Amino acid sequence: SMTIRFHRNDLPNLDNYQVDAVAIDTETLGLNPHRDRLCVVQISPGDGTADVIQIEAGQKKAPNLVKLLKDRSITKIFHFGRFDLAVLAHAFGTMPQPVFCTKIASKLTRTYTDRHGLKEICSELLDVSISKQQQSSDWAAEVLSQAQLEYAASDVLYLHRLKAVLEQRLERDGRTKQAEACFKFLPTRSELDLMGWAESDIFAHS
Amino acid sequence: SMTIRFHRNDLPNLDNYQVDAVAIDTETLGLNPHRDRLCVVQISPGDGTADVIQIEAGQKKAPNLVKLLKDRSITKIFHFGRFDLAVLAHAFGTMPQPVFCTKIASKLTRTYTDRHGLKEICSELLDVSISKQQQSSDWAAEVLSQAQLEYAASDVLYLHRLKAVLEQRLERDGRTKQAEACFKFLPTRSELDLMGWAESDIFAHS
Amino acid sequence: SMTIRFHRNDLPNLDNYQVDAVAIDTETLGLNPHRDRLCVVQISPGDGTADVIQIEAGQKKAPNLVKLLKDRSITKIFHFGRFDLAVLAHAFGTMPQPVFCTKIASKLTRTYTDRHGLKEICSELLDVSISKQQQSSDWAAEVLSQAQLEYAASDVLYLHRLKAVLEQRLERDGRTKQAEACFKFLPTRSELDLMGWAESDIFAHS
Amino acid sequence: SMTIRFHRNDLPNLDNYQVDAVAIDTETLGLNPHRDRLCVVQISPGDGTADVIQIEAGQKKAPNLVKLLKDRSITKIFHFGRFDLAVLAHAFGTMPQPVFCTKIASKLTRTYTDRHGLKEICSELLDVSISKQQQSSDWAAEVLSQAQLEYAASDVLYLHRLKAVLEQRLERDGRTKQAEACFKFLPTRSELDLMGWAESDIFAHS
Amino acid sequence: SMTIRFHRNDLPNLDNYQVDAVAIDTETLGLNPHRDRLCVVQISPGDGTADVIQIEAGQKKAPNLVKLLKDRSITKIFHFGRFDLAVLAHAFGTMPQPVFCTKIASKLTRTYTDRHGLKEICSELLDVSISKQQQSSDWAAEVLSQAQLEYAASDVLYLHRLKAVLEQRLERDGRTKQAEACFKFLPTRSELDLMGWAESDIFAHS
Amino acid sequence: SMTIRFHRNDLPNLDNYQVDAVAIDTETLGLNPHRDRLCVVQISPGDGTADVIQIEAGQKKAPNLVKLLKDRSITKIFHFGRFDLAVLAHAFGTMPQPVFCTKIASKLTRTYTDRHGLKEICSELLDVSISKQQQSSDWAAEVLSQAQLEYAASDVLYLHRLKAVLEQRLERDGRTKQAEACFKFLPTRSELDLMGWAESDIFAHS
Amino acid sequence: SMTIRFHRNDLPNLDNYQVDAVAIDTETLGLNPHRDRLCVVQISPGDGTADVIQIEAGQKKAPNLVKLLKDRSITKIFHFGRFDLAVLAHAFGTMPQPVFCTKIASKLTRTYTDRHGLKEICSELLDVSISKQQQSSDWAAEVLSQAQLEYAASDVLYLHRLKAVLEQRLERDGRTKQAEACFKFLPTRSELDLMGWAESDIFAHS
Amino acid sequence: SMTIRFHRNDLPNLDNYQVDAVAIDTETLGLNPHRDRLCVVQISPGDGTADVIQIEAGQKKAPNLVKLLKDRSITKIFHFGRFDLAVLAHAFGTMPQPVFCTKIASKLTRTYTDRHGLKEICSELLDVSISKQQQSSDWAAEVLSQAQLEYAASDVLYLHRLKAVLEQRLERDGRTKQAEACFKFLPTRSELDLMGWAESDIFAHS
């Protein structure tokens, strides 16, 4: 569609990515990055369109996407980037940075709730209703459905709007600096997950 | 004694602190920094001596100690600094930095155990036996005992040796960079505790 | 509307408050009184109308409201006042007293259920249906919605009726004196929460 | 012995009780006041002696002891009075008041520990070592042993000293008024236990 | 109605109770028999009608009902009689016997499910749909509603049919003798609850 | 019906079972094989039809079914065979082998979900909707309903299709050999359950 | 020794068993009666001697012992008979009755403790110290050690004394009738364990 | 010593390994095989001697040891081999087989205990006392102590004796065939741990 562009392996070029921030999510075969391969990278430049990239089994390279991940002048926006950063670094060898995580930002601003999921925060902060996929999905299937493409695009089409509102909320309640320090540490948090500390809060007493 | 110098309120001067790193621990009336006041700051320059500083109720200033806390050329070493950093910042208004935490370093190197306490790590890494205080102590008492001074000094007399060994272990097992990123975030972790997130892992999914 | 009067900062006068009891609830940015500021005070004189007062960030005074909180001849009615008392005392410096808590009264009379929420008790005791807000709300927003005003008013429009029924039930089942002693202690329970015992039952053995 | 006077049923007179405060503990057949009868009342006037009173099965009266329990000019000191107050009220029909509870006072002062037992607090605050009975005891036996008398006396011989130190600590750390309000509520807390709320914190949200 | 007869205090006579078994349930102010008084006794002779008896506060006698409870030639049927037996014995002084409990019988026959409630078993075994009361009810109210009378009658109108089917099932699967021994012990189980063992399985190892 | 053939005791012949694999499920009186007898064996040759066999109380033999269970050239397919294998071996004396378990295969392929039930996997992998029985069923009843026959047939009508898809998925993700080893062990896992280890993971450390 | 007589298979005669009560315990290969065979029966006539009987694998008969188990004029005393009754009935086909259980009696009298083990109760009630075996024992070994014989005898040498004291305590505290009803049900409790309800309190609500 | 031979990297030859079974244990930097490298392999031919082999960081080959691991005519004995098999396969690329696990064998024979550790089973089955290392050990240190060598040797010096006794016990209690099937599956259990199922019982229902 005009909203969703589908690609195999990689972005074909970076013509749509002359931007200062990109929105990213991924799909995998599960929550264990060492067992469960990367299957889809979905990315948006923030212009109301999304690119959905099917990643093949054994695929080691994605040079155009990786240029964006490495580019320190482009902020990579995620809603809970802790997992996606680990998956992307494990797949292609680059830990993306710098980052903004709308879930960490939500935890530091939406102090009146424990519901920090994407659907809930988009409804509350943006008045945008995104549908949540209910059945489980084999994201490694050779053929992805239009419904799958739409679900993947919905994960990234609104993160720039969400970041804009959350930045205002962080400033209003006085937590911009702490959020930024969390974003600076997040790539290390993801590295530590890959290294074997995924089940440990490294800052806990015991 | 020759090993332990006792002071009221503050260090009398910084003559013993022409160093690149200091070792710090604190004593309080309990684990709630907003309720339980700072009572003692114990600090060592790493030369086999320690200064034990009694902090009065309502004391807002400690200018010589605070110079060290602010000095970015001096690394502040703690064994679990997450609590002490919050207590010190709350008492005197300065978040100490930069820091090295031997407990975080232990968690990243001593992967074969869940025992990361000071007594255990000093025995294993330094062949130094420190006695652990068994009974509870009112650290806000007007008069501190020699036993209390000795317990407080034992917390700081060995942290430079511990840091030296842990740096070697971090290099051997390939985790120096991740440890350093943890140390850079730790002051923010302590700020977040004071701000109201003491019971939350900010990086957890939910 | 005729039922709901909206105000900034404070009641404009006490013309509507020549009464022996007032009904109060609050809205905040969350459940931590030290982190999460007071945002709204909703209050009713018991005449079927409510005042909804928007509290600004950093607001230290609300003299007309505070006159009511201090007035020992006016009983302050809450449904679970433990939290609101702490929030009000923290915001304006006065611990409201005396108080009547319809949730404590419910626990001492409705011995056949564990459901002591406002909606449930209003339905059972008053045959009044109040709608419960389902989505989370930023009560610190500059502009409050009519729906928010209606939710806040619903919290206080029925507490006088609820107190009247619960007083009858307390007398019927013989627990008036014990309830009154609970109400006398409740301001101290709220003070202890602010002081650092919010997670502790002070009367428990261990 | 000169330290311990043994009596059947009641104090023989109040000659030793021309005092402003008495220290009390009890022994029963267990922790359920409705099932497990009162067996012993131990009481001290604070002069370094104790009276140990054996209570018979079915005993409904103890007039000299009850005079002390009713006397509003005599403070009844307990270490955790919540249980003893319920047992005494159930046995003889009078809820003792006013009271001072050294365990509540410990919880409000000894903020650095979770160990609030009598042996621990006597060691820390008084430098007094009391032996703790290790084996279980049938306190309803017709014949009580000297060891049992000594254990019972040890529960009351030091509560006046403990109260004196805890009052100083409450003043030092600013919690005298809150402690006093807890002491005023404690008789109601015990009544509520007898009434059927022994397993419920009446002040909890849910 | 023709199905439901309402009475104050007691059955007016035993004309409808020339039977070998009666079906009984009760309503109280809650689950604590010592705190929560008996409010309603509902009873059926098994002929498709029910008597609903309102019990007053402080009522110590119900001679016609009690004749049935004492009559050893009449089996008292309950669905979970453990509670009702305790409540009835506490109210009127007679422990009813002999008994048949359809919930114990269900546990010994319906080995394929953990759902042993009255509504579920009536649907499965009898093809009878009974409506379950959803809101909480003050059964001590002076005036009981027709809905309350219908709920109470539904508890007893089908227990004879249920017992007939469960007896067949007990015989089919070979557990009649064990069920009967459970029924013989059940009055003691209820006595032990009143005596202070309500929270203990007396047959457990620890 | 043409889809479902009903039999008492055993298959009447093996005319429909000249196949290399059969699909099996069972119904019992519950989850304890020593207490809860086998009641129904449902089996399909994979041709879109099913045989539902009612097993009598005390039935020790089923020679035609048992020929299939013993035939090493016929793979017995189950969705979670651990229970059915134990039940069948206990009833007729033969541990069926070899086996394919679609639930183990699901756990080794559907790494993105914890929902491995038959209804969920048939929907996802086969686009087949099977209805799940909601009420509990006495499968030992003399007369089985058509609904019961349809539920039992639905358990086996699709396992050949499910196995075909799961074999493809096991090959795609590289786990065929591990799945096969699990299938070889499964009969022993079921034997160990019958022997007294039903609640123990024999491979766990402790 | 003079205190302990060892036998293979069975008592050689009943010359020592012309008594009204016997004390019994057993040893097995574990706590699962269906998996773990009976290995030893230890029995005392109450005269300060014990018989220790080694039971062979596959042994189905023990006629002299079984005469005692069946004899309704002989009370079988156990400390926690729930397990031994199941083991004995499973081994030889007779459920022993009538019984007295000193552990149930302890639970109904020693209301001040949760420690109802044999060693603890013998110390408290009898002033008898029995040594507890610390290492695990293969009770199915062909050759039993003298230490094993002494441990087994210690289980039965004191149960008559224990029963005598517990009967006095049951009378003193008014629970003789309830204890007797528990003893009458206990054989059924053991039957229900063998039947498949070992992990269920049959009298619980859910 | 004569009992313990130390080697770097690998066995120097297989002169001592002309045997049908070898006993193996390992030391690592922790319990995560992907993070925590293999540090020591200890192995015994069963002749009362042991070889302790220090494995270097990054060591990919150990050809003499690997010959033994691959040799299908040599049974590899472990006490809990699930972990060691994963570690060895991950280090050198060969999954050792066939295997005998004395911990699985203990679980299938020592049905009277939950203590299946090496020290406990050696004491009970062999009357051999092995000392357990109490402090934590950095097994990756360049220099291993004699105490470390002795601890490592103690893990393997007795496994042949243990296997001999456990084989007798498996035969006595009738579980040889089930144990053998467990041993055949164990290499797959270890593979599944490496593949990402270390925290899942693959045979559980859910």
Author numbering:
A (entry chain A), B (entry chain A), C (entry chain A), D (entry chain A), E (entry chain A), F (entry chain A), ...: 0 to 205
Study authors write:
To further understand the structural basis of NrnC’s substrate preference, we determined structures of B. melitensis NrnC (NrnCBm) in several apo and partially pGG-bound states. (C) Superposition of four apo-NrnCBm conformations based on three independent crystal forms (comprising chains apo1A/apo1B for form 1; apo2A/apo2B for form 2, and apo3A/pGG-bound3B for form 3), compared to the pGG-bound conformation of the same protein shown in (B). In contrast, the Y150 side chain points away from the active site in substrate-free NrnC. While the octameric assembly remains in the absence of substrate, this loop moves outward from the active site and D113 rotates away from the substrate. The most drastic conformational change however is attributed to a flexible loop spanning residues 130SKQQQS135. In contrast, in the substrate-free state NrnCBm, captured in the mixed-state structure or a homogeneous apo-state structure, this loop swings away from the active site or is completely disordered, leading to an overall widening of the active site.
Orn and NrnC are 3′–5′ exonucleases with a DnaQ fold containing the catalytic DEDD motif, a domain that is common in enzymes that act on nucleic acids. Notably, Orn (and its eukaryotic ortholog REXO2) or NrnC activity is critical for cellular growth, rendering them unique amongst the exoribonucleases known to date. Through quantitative structure-function analyses, we show here that NrnC-type RNases share this narrow substrate length preference with Orn. The structures confirm an octameric assembly as a conserved feature of NrnC-type RNases.
